Short mmCIF file of C-alpha atoms and ligand atoms in Angstrom, two decimals:
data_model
loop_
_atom_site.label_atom_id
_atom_site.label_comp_id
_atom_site.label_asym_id
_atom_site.label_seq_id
_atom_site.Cartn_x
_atom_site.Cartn_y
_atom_site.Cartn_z
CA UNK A 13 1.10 -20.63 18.43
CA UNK A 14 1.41 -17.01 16.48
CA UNK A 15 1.94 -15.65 13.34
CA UNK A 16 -1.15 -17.88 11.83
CA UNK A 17 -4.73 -17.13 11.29
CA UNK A 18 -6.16 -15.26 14.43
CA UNK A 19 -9.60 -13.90 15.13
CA UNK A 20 -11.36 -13.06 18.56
CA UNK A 21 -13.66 -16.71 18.77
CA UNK A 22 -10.56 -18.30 19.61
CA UNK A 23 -7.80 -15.96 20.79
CA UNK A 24 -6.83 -13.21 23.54
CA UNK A 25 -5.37 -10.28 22.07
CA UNK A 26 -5.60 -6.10 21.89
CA UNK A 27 -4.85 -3.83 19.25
CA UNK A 28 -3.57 -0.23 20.25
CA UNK A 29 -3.36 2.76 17.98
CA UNK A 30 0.57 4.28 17.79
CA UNK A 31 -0.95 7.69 16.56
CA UNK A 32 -2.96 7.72 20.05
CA UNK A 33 -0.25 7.46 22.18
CA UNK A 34 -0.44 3.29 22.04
CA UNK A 35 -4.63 3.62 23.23
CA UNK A 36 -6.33 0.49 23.00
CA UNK A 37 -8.68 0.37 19.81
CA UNK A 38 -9.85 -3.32 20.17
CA UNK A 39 -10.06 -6.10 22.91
CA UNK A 40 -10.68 -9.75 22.10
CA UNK A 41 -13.39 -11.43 23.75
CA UNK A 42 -11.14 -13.59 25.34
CA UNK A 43 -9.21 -10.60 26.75
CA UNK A 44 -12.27 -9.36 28.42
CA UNK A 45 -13.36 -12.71 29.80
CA UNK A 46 -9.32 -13.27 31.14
CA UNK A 47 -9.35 -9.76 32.89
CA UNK A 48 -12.82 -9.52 33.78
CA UNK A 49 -12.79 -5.96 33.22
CA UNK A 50 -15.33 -5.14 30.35
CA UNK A 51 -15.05 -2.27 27.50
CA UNK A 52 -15.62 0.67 29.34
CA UNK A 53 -12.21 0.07 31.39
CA UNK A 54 -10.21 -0.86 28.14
CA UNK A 55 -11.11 1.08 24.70
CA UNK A 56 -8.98 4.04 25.04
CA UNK A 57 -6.67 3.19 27.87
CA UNK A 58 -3.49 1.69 27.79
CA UNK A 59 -2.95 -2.00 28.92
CA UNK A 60 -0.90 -0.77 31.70
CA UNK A 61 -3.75 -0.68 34.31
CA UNK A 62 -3.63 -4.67 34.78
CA UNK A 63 -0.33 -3.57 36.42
CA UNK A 64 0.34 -3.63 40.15
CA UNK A 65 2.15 -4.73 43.22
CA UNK A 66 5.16 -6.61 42.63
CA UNK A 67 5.03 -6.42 38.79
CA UNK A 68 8.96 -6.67 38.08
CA UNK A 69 10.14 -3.22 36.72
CA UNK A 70 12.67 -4.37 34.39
CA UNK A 71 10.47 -6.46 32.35
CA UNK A 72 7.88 -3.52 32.07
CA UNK A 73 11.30 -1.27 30.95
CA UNK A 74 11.95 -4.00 28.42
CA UNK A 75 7.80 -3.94 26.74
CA UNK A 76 8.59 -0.25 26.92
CA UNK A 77 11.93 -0.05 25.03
CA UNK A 78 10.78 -3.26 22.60
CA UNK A 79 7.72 -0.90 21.76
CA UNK A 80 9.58 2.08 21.52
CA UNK A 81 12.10 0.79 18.42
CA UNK A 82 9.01 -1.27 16.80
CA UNK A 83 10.00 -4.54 17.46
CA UNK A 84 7.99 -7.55 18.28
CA UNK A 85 8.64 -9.21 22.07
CA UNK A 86 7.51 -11.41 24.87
CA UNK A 87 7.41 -11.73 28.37
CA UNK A 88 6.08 -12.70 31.57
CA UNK A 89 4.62 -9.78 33.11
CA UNK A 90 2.30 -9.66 36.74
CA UNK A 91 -1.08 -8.68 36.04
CA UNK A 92 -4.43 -8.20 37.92
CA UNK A 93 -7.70 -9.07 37.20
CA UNK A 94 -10.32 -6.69 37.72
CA UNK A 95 -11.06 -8.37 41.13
CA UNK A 96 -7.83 -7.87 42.36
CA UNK A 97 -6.69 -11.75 41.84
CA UNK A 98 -2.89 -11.81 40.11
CA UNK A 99 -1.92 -13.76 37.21
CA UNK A 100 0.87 -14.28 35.36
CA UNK A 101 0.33 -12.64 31.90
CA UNK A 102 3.26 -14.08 29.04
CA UNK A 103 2.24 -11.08 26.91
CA UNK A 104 3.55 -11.24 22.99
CA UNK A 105 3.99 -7.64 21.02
CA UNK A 106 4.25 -7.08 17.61
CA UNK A 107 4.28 -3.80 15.81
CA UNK A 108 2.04 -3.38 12.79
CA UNK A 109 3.31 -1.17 10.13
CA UNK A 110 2.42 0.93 7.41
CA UNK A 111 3.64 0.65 3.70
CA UNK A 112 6.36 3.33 4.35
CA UNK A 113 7.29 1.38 7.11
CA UNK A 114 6.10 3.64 10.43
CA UNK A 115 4.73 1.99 13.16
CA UNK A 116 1.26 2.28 13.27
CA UNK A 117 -0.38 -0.42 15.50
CA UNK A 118 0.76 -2.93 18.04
CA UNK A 119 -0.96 -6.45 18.32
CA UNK A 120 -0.58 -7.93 22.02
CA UNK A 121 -1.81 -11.61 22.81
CA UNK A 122 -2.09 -12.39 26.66
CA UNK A 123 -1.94 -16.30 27.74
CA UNK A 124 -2.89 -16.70 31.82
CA UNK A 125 -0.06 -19.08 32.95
CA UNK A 126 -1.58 -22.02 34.04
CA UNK A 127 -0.03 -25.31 35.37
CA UNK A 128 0.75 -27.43 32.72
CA UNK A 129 0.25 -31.23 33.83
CA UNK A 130 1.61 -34.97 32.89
CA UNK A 131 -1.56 -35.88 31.76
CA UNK A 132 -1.68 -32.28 29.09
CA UNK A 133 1.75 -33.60 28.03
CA UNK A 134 0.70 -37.13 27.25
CA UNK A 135 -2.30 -35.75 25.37
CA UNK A 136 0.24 -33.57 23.60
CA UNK A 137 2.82 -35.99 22.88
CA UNK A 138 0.36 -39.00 22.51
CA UNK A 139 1.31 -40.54 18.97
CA UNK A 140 -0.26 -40.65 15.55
C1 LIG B 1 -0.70 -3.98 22.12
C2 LIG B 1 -0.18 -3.88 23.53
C3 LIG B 1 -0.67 -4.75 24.48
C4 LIG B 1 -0.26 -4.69 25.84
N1 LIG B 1 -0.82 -5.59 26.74
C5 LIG B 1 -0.39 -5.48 28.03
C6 LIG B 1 -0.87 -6.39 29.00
O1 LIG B 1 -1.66 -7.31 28.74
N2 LIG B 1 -0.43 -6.24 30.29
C7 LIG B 1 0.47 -5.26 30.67
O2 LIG B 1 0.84 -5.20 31.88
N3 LIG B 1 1.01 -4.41 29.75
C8 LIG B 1 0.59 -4.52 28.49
N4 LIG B 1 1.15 -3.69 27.55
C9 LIG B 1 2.23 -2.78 27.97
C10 LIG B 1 1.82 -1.41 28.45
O3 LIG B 1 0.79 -0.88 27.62
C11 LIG B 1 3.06 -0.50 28.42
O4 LIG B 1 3.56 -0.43 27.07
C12 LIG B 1 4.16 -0.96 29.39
O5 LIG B 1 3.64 -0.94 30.73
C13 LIG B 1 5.44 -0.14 29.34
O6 LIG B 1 5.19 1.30 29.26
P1 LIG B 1 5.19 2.16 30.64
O7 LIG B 1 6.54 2.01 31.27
O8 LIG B 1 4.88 3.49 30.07
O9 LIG B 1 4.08 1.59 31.46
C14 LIG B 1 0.72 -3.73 26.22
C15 LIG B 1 1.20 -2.85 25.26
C16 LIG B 1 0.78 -2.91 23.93
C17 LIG B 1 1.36 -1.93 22.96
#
């Protein structure tokens, strides 16, 4: 669920500025809570930090490219909480741009992978 209303009471996302070299400009709450790192880690760094062992190198060539030409994408990425604990981060881009068209800011939204059960299913899929 995308492209529809978003604010930070319900969602995890970042902004990042594309005149400061893609630095973060804004966190949601939820971003904060997910990573456990807090502001002082974030505003003004780039999102690559919750990178680390074993995060697959092709997929972080593909966020890089995607964000290079301005074009929205997903993937699964490895990430790290701030304690060192890994999670599996399905990260969606999409550029934000400018009147004349330039790329000015990128929105990110992070989802945690987490199991996804029957019984979620059933709720999902329960009729009427
Ligand atoms: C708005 C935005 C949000 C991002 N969020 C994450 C994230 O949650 N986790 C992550 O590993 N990389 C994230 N990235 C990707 C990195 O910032 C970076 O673009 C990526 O690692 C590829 O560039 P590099 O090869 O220079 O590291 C995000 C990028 C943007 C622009």
């Amino acid at each position: 669920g995308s492209k529809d209303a978003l604010s930070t009471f319900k969602h995890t996302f970042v902004v990042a500025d594309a005149t400061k070299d893609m630095a973060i400009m804004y966190a949601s709450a939820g971003f904060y809570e997910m990573t456990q790192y807090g502001p002082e880690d974030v505003i003004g760094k780039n999102c690559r930090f919750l990178q680390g062992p074993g995060t697959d190198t092709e997929e972080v060539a593909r966020i890089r490219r995607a964000i290079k030409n301005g074009e929205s994408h997903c993937g699964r990425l490895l990430n790290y909480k701030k304690d060192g604990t890994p999670f599996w981060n399905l990260l969606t881009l999409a550029p934000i741009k400018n009147e004349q068209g330039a790329v000015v800011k990128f929105i990110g939204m992070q989802v945690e992978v987490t199991q996804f059960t029957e019984g979620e299913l059933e709720k999902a899929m329960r009729p009427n």
